[PDB]
């Protein structure tokens, strides 16, 4: 639900590194669990044990991605002393992308991940700053 | 009013046109047999309609004028070249076989349309059934490859799974030495080159793979050369037998409506004869296809629809 | 392997046809000499004679809708007036400051 | 196949076209006059 | 404006009702007549514009482009007459129909009072070119080339539609006159930055900007001669015209936004000029030269000064004419040799002297020899860039030197040396090809007598 | 000519886009046609809508 | 909204989940559909009777009739599938695939 | 001197069950040309 | 089947759709859906074979589940408010259940899995009917209650449908599955504007229906269901291939074709409501549909594929039956962009 979003967003950007990391870990774990549920439903690989192994692997990968992103972004915001700057989200986002590359153990996915997650995180920060709506209400 | 759903709704029922005489009949015999004479005789005595055996240019006789078209515009194959060089490198043998099978399919559709539209029966030579005997002989003699017979089997299945088998099959049996003597007496120089192995393989295929299979769903009259000379006994056997084992008694008015819609619209009849499977004997390149199609379009009465050709002499074009 | 080593029935690649062989003085427009010659004539006439010459002359003698000599005369009369009256030629302000209401800062 | 110009269908087509054109012109004239009457132009 | 549009539309029924052996003559004659009508538009005023109606206007920026577009069609027909000899009448009529539709779309694009109409026609030009490339193309890579050409353009231009509808929702109008008169500054904001990017990238991808120029060599090499002519002459200038029209609302954001694109173009002209030095294909070399010229035009438009705009307009016209002539010469060689490789046919000056003269004049014009309008635009843009920054002169000089180098390399490799011995099918040049080259080259030397006609609205 | 233009510029936009789209197409279209998995996914989807959008 | 309505809604949810599982035996799928319509009948009847809305006493009958007609249609389809393959197993319907 | 046109080898790319064949889908076969698949009387012993 | 029975069944399908469209009572809408489902199955199973039976049973299962969910939503709405009229839904839970049921009926993602297989199993005429007429009733019901829909869920399933259609159309060689994925993508486009304007939804529905009718009628005319079978059409009837290529270009949203109208208007309307990101993603994703349309056009008309010898007989025969309105549908799906402001008629 939106409870995880509220718990993550209520924390200030430049403080409480551990709280932000924990919230990011929870969000990543939820996303990984949903992806694992879809993967199990659409593709039952061989058995119950291999399926739960797949679920655990996906969940841990997503949770690690979220934790690294949150920790790196919050530390960058704290150290640089310039909050509300998309560069911090860029750096943290593709620290998470590099951790994805390390987990999957291939350099190309790591570089692609840094590109396409740093840009995504910077875009999200820009949208928060400028008030962009993804799901706009019907104004007119 | 062309036949369709509206005609079936209002008045058109073809079950009332059946008068126990329809009885589609097919006559099968080995090369240079007396079957053509025998088939013709049966048609005249029973009052049915005779269908001469379909050749390379059978389809040419039913569209436009009855005159045949050029070989490169119709068939792209010749029987004389098959007799002269059965192992020709340009794949003429299987092209001939496939074109002849398609011609037989079109002729069978035409005969079925006539029978279902008028009620008058028809008499046919070698039909889509038993056309495989030439394929089997050609394969056993090494004239064609195995992929060719696989393609023939696929096309034959997909096409012939949609028609009713003949009521009565009439076979004239002639020994191979006698038929070779008849070939020698015929005088055709190209037909002289037929080997005895080819005829024996043909003959083996007819008895072994065709007679019992049609015995299980049709009525068979195996006849020899001497006893086929008199058609009176043949006709008497024709009326004496009653068909009660085939699918024909199981049909009704709705199945007849479906089959009548199928037999007309010949483009649907010939739909699966050009399946996109690429065998070098029958596949044609883009440039040659374009050139031949452009030449065909340049034929006098073939650029437009049959009634829209001023060059032939069609008038009132601007109001049709 | 009794395969014919032929993938399909294809026409051979045709050889390029020379326009000069069957018709010298070919002009490179068409294989039919009459249509060829008339195509050459119409192309040469309607391009060189009509467009390239008449349109060039038309563009050369276009009237001054861009108003160059008009600007020359206006500038000449203004400089005559200003030199004679002691005015210092061109003025730094394009608009008279009397008609601009600046906003008071009071900082 | 072998067909003569079907005069029944040609006649019906031409009659439908002419009837549609005349009805359209009459409708347009009525609309113009009734518009003028409502807004008091003429 | 309809006095040009209606005859172009009537070109279609005339073509489709022509005799089987009279399509080319009629099309050429009526296209030349249409071009003569277009000449009247050149008369322009120093004031606002030639506002014909609510839908169309003309300007001294649009007038030379319209004249070039109308003039190009007879040349394309002349070039296409040869290789379509063995084609059926219906398909030749379809080819002529594609060319006429492309001309009509370009003509309506260049007038286009309203920006959504401009976008609609600017995208409508994409279909006939794609059909020409992927239908009447010789090689098997024409399909991939057409896919690249379609998808680069569409990916670039899809955000432009969103930007335009947003701009109309906010401002209330997309008519260019109201946009110009009611212009307001853009605040330095992330939303404004992305709006600037969406407004700019669609025209950048079609210039082509360096790094986004991959589609151009494929499309130019795989297209038939008429397609190459139109792509090199007119279709590349659509991006420049759009940038010139749309940079009025991007101020003062453009002052710092332009740097990434300025650096890309300034280094990419050097890169593509150096690429031209090592090329085994004539068409690829000409395409990369086009890329260099259009990169320098991008620099001119981004600098956004009056001299920049005048130089950009002059260079656009001159490059269109020169690239069309070079492609035509390459096609004349190809139709004899059927190879499209520089090193195969050598020493053609001995066999074809007049065509060698045409080659020399085309290379000199591409080399920007004074007082050709190519050098007029080149020098105006160089001076404007020097005023922008004195350090640009190094890159501009390097580009000039490399340009002269590969132009004379292309001339010497094909025209000089010893003829290839085993090639014996090199027939004398036809009158059609010579007339094509003459009609390409004479307008350039006539326009250098009246440079004010191609210097744009800021003259 | 080679390293930048024919390799890396080609790798960045077009080849990457083609590879990603082809992989996503393979993932989406690789379904065995068993209604078991389809309606299991429908059940999973229905539960998510109830608990995540309200 | 008291506990009886919650129990009936829970029964409907259980029947829907059992339908969406598909261990095997399409007959069980039809059984789950009929359990769903039975739960719908019960809960709608309770709502209608509680509020004394006289004119909707028709609606449960209409629902029952239409759902039983749908049940007959599904049974016919199952019979045709079984005559095609010899069994009503779900996994035999894999000829058409995404 | 001739415009290239697709041949059998090129045309065979579009003849499979799906585009972009994979290991899992390698065994998939196209549907039959007509959408018909092959179809692939009890006794009673009334004794005493 | 008997032509009388077929006509009666088609009339029953149409009358069920009209009953859904004209009624104001929820029970009558449910009855219309049930009648349409009941009369739809024999139309799909008209040509009896195992594939059609499997498609029919899949369709029956999906539609029965959707109808049960819709009935449950109606009953919950009645429970929380004694109302039978189709208006504001009055309940958050009831609305969610109803939206999923209508999405399952329409085939929106993630409930899209049945559309490609049902389309592949049935013939081309049944596919035409299923992909054109069977969208009117659920879309009309969604339009009537558009003020109640949660925009987040509607937009999520719309974007999912667009992405799924774009990705799944890339992998197909069968024409019917291509048309099914195209239908899924177009449905996703249609439902992304319901929260903002229903007139745009109806305009998109009309344009898509015209284009789909043109495409299916062209495919029926040249009796091909695979890419390679359609690659043989140029050797007999090149005009059909050229018209098909123009229609495919129109279906890809390329201006100035008719298919550019719905996407243009939907983007403009969504931008009026301060929505920017979603139209950009939607156009980017529709690029994939355009790509596989271009692949089909390449295989069909822009190049000439090898032919077979037996086409010479087909050269001699003409189609016995000519489909009326095929010319009108092609023109309407190709050349109606200049008539865009006519959408104010509340089409
Ligand atoms: C706008 C929204 C549009 C929604 C989408 C359009 C729905 C299209 C389906 C229409 C019905 C099927 C159909 O017409 O085929 C498509 C048709 C192609 O037909 P076909 O594939 O050649 O026909 C083969 C039939 O499937 C083979 O059928 P048959 O030959 O067995 O049928 C016999 C025929 C002949 O009918 C009769 O004999 C009359 C008998 C009267 C019996 C009375 C019973 C009373 C109870 O009856 C019909 O064809 C159906 C008549 C239904 C009338 C409904 C009013 O093309 C179109 O319908 C496109 C029309 C354009 C859209 C609709 C009109 C414009 C708006
Ligand atoms: C300098 C003043 C000249 C006044 C005389 C008027 C000349 C009229 C020329 C009209 C334009 C030429 C058309 C181009 C194609 C040529 C046609 C042809 O095939 O000839 C066959 C014909 C018959 O010979 P053939 O034996 O049958 O053919 C055998 C082979 O073709 C073998 O033939 P080839 O080996 O003899 O070579 C062909 C020849 C012809 O091919 C060409 O390359 C000639 C075109 C060179 C220009 C290249 C573009 C560079 C930008 C210049 C743009 C300015 C144009 C001004 C307005 C032009 C109006 C149309 O190429 C050359 O001779 C080398 C040209 C290199 C000259 C570099 C100097 C250029 C800049 C000079 C400044 C110009 C303005 C001065 C401003 C300050 C003072 C007021 O030969 C000739 O008649 C040659 C043409 C005359 C030479 C022109 C050289 C300078 C004139 C340039 C334009 C006029 C300037 C106006 C100022 C007047 C004061
Ligand atoms: C081959 C061997 C030699 C034989 C020839 C010997 C003779 C030599 C002469 C050739 C050039 C010598 C230079 C002499 C120049 C004199 C002519 C000049 O003065 O006229 C120019 C005029 O030239 C035209 O302005 C330019 C030509 C028009 C170009 C348009 C191209 C035609 C359309 C074709 C399609 C367009 C394609 C490109 C799209 C833009 C400039 O005149 P300008 O001082 O100003 O004012 C004109 C007079 N006023 C004051 C009354 C107004
Ligand atoms: C691939 C071949 C070529 C294709 C075309 C390439 C051209 C596109 C490049 C886009 C131009 C620049 C984009 C934004 C420029 C604005 C300036 C900004 O970036 O600089 C600093 C911005 O700081 C940081 O850069 C923040 C952004 C960090 C995240 C961006 C990702 C960096 C690399 C991504 C490149 C990927 C390009 C290709 C995409 C597929 C200034 O600090 P700040 O004062 O705070 O911000 C000022 C702007 N304000 C006033 C609106 C707030
Ligand atoms: C989020 C979704 C974003 C949507 C992006 C849409 C991009 C538009 C093109 C999509 C094409 C993807 C499919 C594809 O190309 O597959 C690889 C394909 C496989 O060949 P097939 O024809 O399928 O099979 C042949 C053997 N039988 O390989 C190719 O042919 C590639 C040739 C086409 C290249 C096109 C270049 C497109 C990229 C240009 C840059 C911009 C792309 C668009 C998005 C950019 C990001 C803003
Ligand atoms: C050759 C391929 C090139 C493809 C194009 C690359 C650039 C694309 C441009 C960015 C995409 C979005 C364009 C924005 C549309 C204009 C609308 C606008 O400017 O309004 C902005 C909207 O701005 C945005 O929403 C932008 C969000 C971006 C989401 C899409 C990301 C696409 C990729 C972005 C990174 C790449 C951009 C450069 C690419 C470089 C070349 C490859 C403000 O919105 P409001 O909320 O109404 O006002 C704020 C005050 N309340
Ligand atoms: N399947 C076939 N393949 C090749 N040729 C065939 C085939 N079927 C019939 N023919 C040829 O058709 C001709 C007529 O057949 P046939 O019965 O032998 O002579 P007739 O019609 O005089 O009785 C013969 O020359 C025969 O070879």
UniProtKB/TrEMBL annotation, chain A:
It holds the Pfam family Tim17. GO terms for biological process: mitochondrial electron transport, NADH to ubiquinone. Keywords: Membrane, Mitochondrion, Mitochondrion inner membrane, Transmembrane, Transmembrane helix, Ubiquinone. It is found in: Mitochondrion inner membrane. It is a multi-pass membrane protein. Disulfide bonds join 17-74, 94-114. This is NADH dehydrogenase [ubiquinone] 1 alpha subcomplex subunit 11. Belongs to the complex I NDUFA11 subunit family. GO terms for cellular component: mitochondrial inner membrane; respiratory chain complex I.
Automatic annotation (TrEMBL), chain B:
GTP 4 binds at residues 32-36, 83, 97, 104, 126, 134, 186. Mg(2+) 1 binds at residues 30, 32. Coiled coil: none annotated. It is found in: Mitochondrion matrix. GO terms for biological process: mitochondrial electron transport, NADH to ubiquinone. It holds the Pfam family dNK. Its main location: mitochondrion. Accessory subunit of the mitochondrial membrane respiratory chain NADH dehydrogenase (Complex I), that is believed not to be involved in catalysis. Complex I functions in the transfer of electrons from NADH to the respiratory chain. The immediate electron acceptor for the enzyme is believed to be ubiquinone. Belongs to the complex I NDUFA10 subunit family. This is NADH dehydrogenase [ubiquinone] 1 alpha subcomplex subunit 10, mitochondrial. The gene is NDUFA10.
TrEMBL record, chain D:
The keyword Mitochondrion applies. One of its GO terms (cellular component) is mitochondrial inner membrane. Keywords: Electron transport, Membrane, Mitochondrion, Mitochondrion inner membrane, Respiratory chain, Transit peptide, Transmembrane, Transmembrane helix, Transport. It is a single-pass membrane protein. It comes from the Eukaryota. Its main location: mitochondrion. It is found in: Mitochondrion inner membrane. Accessory subunit of the mitochondrial membrane respiratory chain NADH dehydrogenase (Complex I), that is believed not to be involved in catalysis. Complex I functions in the transfer of electrons from NADH to the respiratory chain. The immediate electron acceptor for the enzyme is believed to be ubiquinone. Belongs to the complex I NDUFC1 subunit family. Complex I is composed of 45 different subunits. This is NADH dehydrogenase [ubiquinone] 1 subunit C1, mitochondrial. The lineage of its organism: Eukaryota, Metazoa, Chordata, Craniata, Vertebrata. The gene is NDUFC1.
Automatic annotation (TrEMBL), chain H:
Belongs to the complex I 49 kDa subunit family. This is NADH dehydrogenase [ubiquinone] iron-sulfur protein 2, mitochondrial. Core subunit of respiratory chain NADH dehydrogenase (Complex I) which is composed of 45 different subunits. Component of the iron-sulfur (IP) fragment of the enzyme. Interacts with NDUFAF3. Interacts with NDUFAF7. Interacts with CERS2. Coiled coil: none annotated.
């Amino acid at each position: 639900a939106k409870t995880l979003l509220h718990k993550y967003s209520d924390i200030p950007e430049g403080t409480e590194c551990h709280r932000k990391a924990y919230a990011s870990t929870s969000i990543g774990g939820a996303t990984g669990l949903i992806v694992s549920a879809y993967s199990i439903a659409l593709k039952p690989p061989a058995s119950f044990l291999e399926g739960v192994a797949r679920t655990g692997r996906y969940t841990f990968t997503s949770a690690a991605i979220g934790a690294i992103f949150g920790l790196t972004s919050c530390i960058s915001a704290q150290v640089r002393e310039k909050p509300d700057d998309p560069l911090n989200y860029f750096i943290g986002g593709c620290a998470g992308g590099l951790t994805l590359g390390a987990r999957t153990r291939s350099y190309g996915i790591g570089a692609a991940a840094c590109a396409y997650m740093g840009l995504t995180a910077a875009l999200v920060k820009m949208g928060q700053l400028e008030g962009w709506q993804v799901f706009a209400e019907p104004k007119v | 009013l062309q036949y369709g759903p509206l005609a079936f709704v209002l008045g058109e029922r073809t079950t009332r046109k059946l008068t126990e005489t329809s009885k589609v009949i097919t006559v099968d015999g080995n090369i240079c047999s007396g079957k053509g004479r025998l088939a013709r005789e049966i048609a005249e005595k029973l009052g049915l309609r005779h269908f001469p055996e379909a050749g390379i240019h059978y389809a040419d006789s039913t569209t436009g004028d009855g005159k045949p078209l050029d070989v490169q515009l119709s068939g792209n194959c010749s029987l004389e070249k098959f007799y002269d060089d059965p192992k020709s490198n340009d794949g003429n043998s299987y092209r001939l076989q496939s074109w002849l099978y398609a011609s037989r399919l079109l002729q069978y559709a035409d005969a079925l349309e006539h029978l279902l539209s008028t009620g008058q029966g028809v008499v046919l030579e070698r039909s889509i059934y038993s056309d495989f005997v030439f394929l089997e002989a050609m394969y056993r003699q090494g004239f064609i490859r195995k992929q060719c017979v696989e393609h023939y089997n696929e096309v034959k299945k997909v096409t012939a799974c949609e028609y009713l088998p003949p009521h009565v099959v009439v076979y004239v049996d002639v020994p191979v030495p006698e038929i070779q003597s008849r070939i020698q007496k015929k005088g055709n120089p190209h037909e002289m080159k037929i080997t005895a192995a080819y005829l024996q393989d043909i003959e083996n295929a007819y008895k072994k793979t065709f007679l019992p299979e049609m015995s299980e769903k049709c009525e068979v009259l195996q006849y020899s050369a001497r006893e086929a000379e008199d058609a009176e006994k043949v006709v008497e056997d024709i009326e004496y037998l009653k068909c009660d084992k085939g699918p024909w008694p199981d049909q009704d008015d709705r199945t007849f409506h479906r089959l009548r819609m199928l037999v007309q619209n010949k483009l649907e009849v010939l739909n699966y004869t050009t399946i996109p499977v690429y065998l070098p004997e029958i596949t044609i390149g883009a440039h040659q296809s374009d050139r031949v199609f452009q030449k065909f379009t340049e034929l006098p009465g073939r650029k437009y629809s049959p009634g829209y050709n001023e060059d032939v002499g069609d008038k009132w074009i601007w109001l049709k | 392997p009794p395969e014919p080593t032929i993938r399909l029935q294809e026409d051979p690649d045709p050889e390029d046809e020379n326009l000069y062989e069957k018709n010298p003085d070919s002009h490179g427009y068409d294989k039919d000499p009459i249509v060829d010659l008339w195509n050459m004539r119409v192309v040469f006439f309607f391009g060189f004679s009509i467009v390239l010459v008449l349109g060039s002359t038309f563009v050369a003698y276009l009237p001054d809708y861009r108003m160059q000599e008009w600007a020359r005369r206006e500038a000449e009369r203004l400089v005559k007036y200003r030199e004679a009256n002691g005015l210092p030629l061109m003025e730094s302000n394009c608009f008279d400051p009397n008609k601009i209401q600046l906003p008071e800062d009071e900082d | 196949p072998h067909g003569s110009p079907d005069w029944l269908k040609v006649g019906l087509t031409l009659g439908t076209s002419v009837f549609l054109w005349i009805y359209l012109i009459k409708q347009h004239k009525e609309d113009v006059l009734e518009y003028k009457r409502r807004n008091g132009l003429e | 404006m309809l006095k040009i549009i209606i005859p172009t539309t009537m070109l279609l029924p005339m073509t489709w009702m022509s005799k089987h052996n009279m399509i080319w003559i009629n099309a050429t004659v009526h296209s030349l007549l249409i071009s003569l009508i277009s000449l009247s538009l050149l008369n322009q005023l120093g004031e606002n514009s030639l506002n014909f109606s609510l839908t169309f206007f003309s300007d001294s920026l649009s007038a030379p482009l319209l004249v070039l577009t109308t003039w190009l069609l007879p040349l394309m027909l002349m070039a296409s007459q040869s290789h379509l000899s063995k084609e059926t009448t219906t398909r030749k009529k379809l080819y002529i129909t594609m060319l006429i539709l492309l001309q009509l779309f370009l003509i309506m694009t260049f007038t286009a009072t309203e920006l959504i109409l401009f976008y609609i026609l600017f995208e409508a030009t994409l279909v006939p070119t794609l059909i020409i490339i992927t239908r009447w193309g010789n090689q098997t890579e024409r399909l991939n080339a057409g896919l690249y050409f379609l998808f680069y353009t569409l990916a670039g231009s899809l955000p432009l539609l969103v930007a335009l509808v947003y701009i109309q929702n906010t401002t209330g109008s997309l008519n260019f006159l109201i946009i110009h008169y009611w212009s307001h500054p853009l605040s330095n904001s992330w939303s404004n930055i992305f709006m600037w990017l969406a407004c700019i990238m669609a025209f950048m991808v079609k210039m082509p900007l360096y790094g986004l120029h991959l589609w151009l060599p494929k499309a130019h090499v795989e297209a038939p001669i008429a397609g190459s002519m139109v792509l090199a002459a007119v279709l590349l200038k659509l991006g420049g015209y759009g940038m010139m029209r749309i940079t009025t609302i991007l101020n003062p954001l453009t002052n710092y936004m332009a740097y990434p694109f300025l650096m890309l173009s300034m280094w990419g002209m050097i890169m593509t000029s150096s690429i031209c030095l090592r090329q085994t294909d004539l068409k690829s070399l000409i395409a990369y030269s086009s890329v260099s010229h259009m990169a320098l035009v991008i620099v001119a438009i981004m600098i956004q000064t009056p001299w920049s705009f005048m130089g950009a307009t002059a260079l656009m016209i001159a490059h269109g004419l020169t690239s069309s002539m070079l492609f035509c010469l390459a096609n004349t060689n190809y139709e004899r040799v059927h190879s499209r490789t520089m090193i195969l046919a050598r020493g053609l000056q001995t066999l074809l002297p007049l065509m060698a003269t045409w080659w020399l004049v085309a290379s000199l014009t591409n080399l920007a020899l004074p007082p050709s309008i190519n050098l007029i635009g080149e020098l105006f843009i160089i001076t404007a860039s020097f005023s922008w920054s004195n350090i640009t002169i190094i890159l501009m000089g390097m580009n000039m030197m490399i340009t002269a180098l590969y132009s004379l390399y292309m001339l010497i490799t094909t025209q000089r040396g010893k003829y290839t011995h085993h090639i014996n099918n090199i027939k004398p040049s036809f009158t059609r090809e010579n007339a094509l080259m003459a009609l390409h080259i004479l307008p350039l030397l006539l326009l250098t007598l009246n440079p004010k006609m191609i210097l744009g609205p800021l003259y | 000519s080679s390293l930048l233009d024919l390799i890396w510029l080609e790798t960045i936009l077009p080849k990457t886009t083609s590879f990603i789209q082809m992989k996503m197409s393979i993932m989406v279209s690789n379904q065995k046609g068993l209604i078991k998995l389809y309606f299991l996914s429908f059940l999973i989807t229905i539960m998510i809508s109830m608990t995540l959008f309200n | 909204m008291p506990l009886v309505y919650m129990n009936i809604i829970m029964a409907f949810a259980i029947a829907l989940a059992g339908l969406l599982m598909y261990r095997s035996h399409l007959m069980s799928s039809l059984l789950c559909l009929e359990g769903m319509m039975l739960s719908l009948f019960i809960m709608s009847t309770l709502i209608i009777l509680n509020t004394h809305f006289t004119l909707a006493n028709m609606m449960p009958i209409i629902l029952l009739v239409f759902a039983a007609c749908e049940a007959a249609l599904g049974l016919s389809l199952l019979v045709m599938v079984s005559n095609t393959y010899g069994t009503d197993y779900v996994q035999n319907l894999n000829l058409l695939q995404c | 001197a001739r415009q290239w046109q697709p041949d059998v080898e090129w045309a065979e790319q579009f003849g499979g069950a799906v585009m972009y064949p994979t290991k899992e889908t390698a065994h998939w076969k196209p549907p039959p040309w007509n959408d018909v698949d092959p179809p692939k009387n009890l006794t009673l012993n009334f004794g005493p | 089947m008997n032509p009388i029975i077929y006509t009666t069944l088609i009339m029953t399908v149409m009358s069920g759709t009209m009953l859904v469209m004209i009624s104001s009572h929820w029970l009558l809408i449910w009855i219309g859906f049930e009648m349409n489902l009941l009369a739809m199955i024999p139309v799909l199973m008209k040509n009896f074979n195992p594939r059609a039976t499997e498609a029919a049973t899949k369709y029956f299962l999906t539609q029965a589940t959707a109808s049960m969910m819709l009935m449950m939503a109606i009953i919950i709405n009645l429970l929380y408010s004694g109302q039978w009229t189709i208006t504001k839904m009055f309940n958050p839970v009831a609305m969610t259940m109803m939206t999923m049921a209508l999405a399952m009926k329409l085939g929106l993602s993630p409930f899209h899995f049945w559309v490609p297989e049902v389309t592949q199993g049935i013939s081309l005429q049944a596919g035409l009917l299923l992909l054109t007429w069977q969208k009117l009733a659920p879309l009309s019901v969604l339009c009537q209650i558009s003020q109640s829909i949660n925009p987040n869920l509607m937009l999520t399933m719309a974007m999912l449908s667009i992405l799924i259609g774009g990705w799944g159309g890339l992998n197909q060689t069968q024409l019917r599955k291509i048309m099914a994925y195209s239908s899924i993508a177009h449905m996703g486009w249609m439902t992304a504007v319901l929260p903002y304007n229903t007139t745009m939804t109806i305009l998109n529905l009309l344009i898509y229906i015209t284009m789909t009718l043109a495409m299916f009628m062209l495919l029926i005319h040249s009796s091909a269901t695979t890419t390679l079978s359609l690659s043989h059409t140029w050797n007999k009837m090149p005009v059909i291939t050229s018209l098909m290529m123009v229609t495919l270009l129109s279906m890809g949203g390329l201006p100035p074709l008719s298919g550019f109208m719905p996407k243009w208007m939907i983007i403009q309307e969504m931008t009026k409501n301060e929505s920017i990101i979603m139209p950009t993603l939607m156009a980017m994703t529709a690029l994939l549909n355009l790509y596989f349309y271009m692949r089909l056009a390449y295989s069909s008309s822009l190049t000439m594929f090898p032919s077979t010898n037996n086409m010479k007989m087909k050269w001699q025969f003409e189609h016995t039956k000519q489909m009326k309105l095929l010319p009108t549908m092609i023109v309407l799906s190709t050349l109606v962009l200049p008539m865009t402001p006519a959408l104010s008629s509340l089409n």
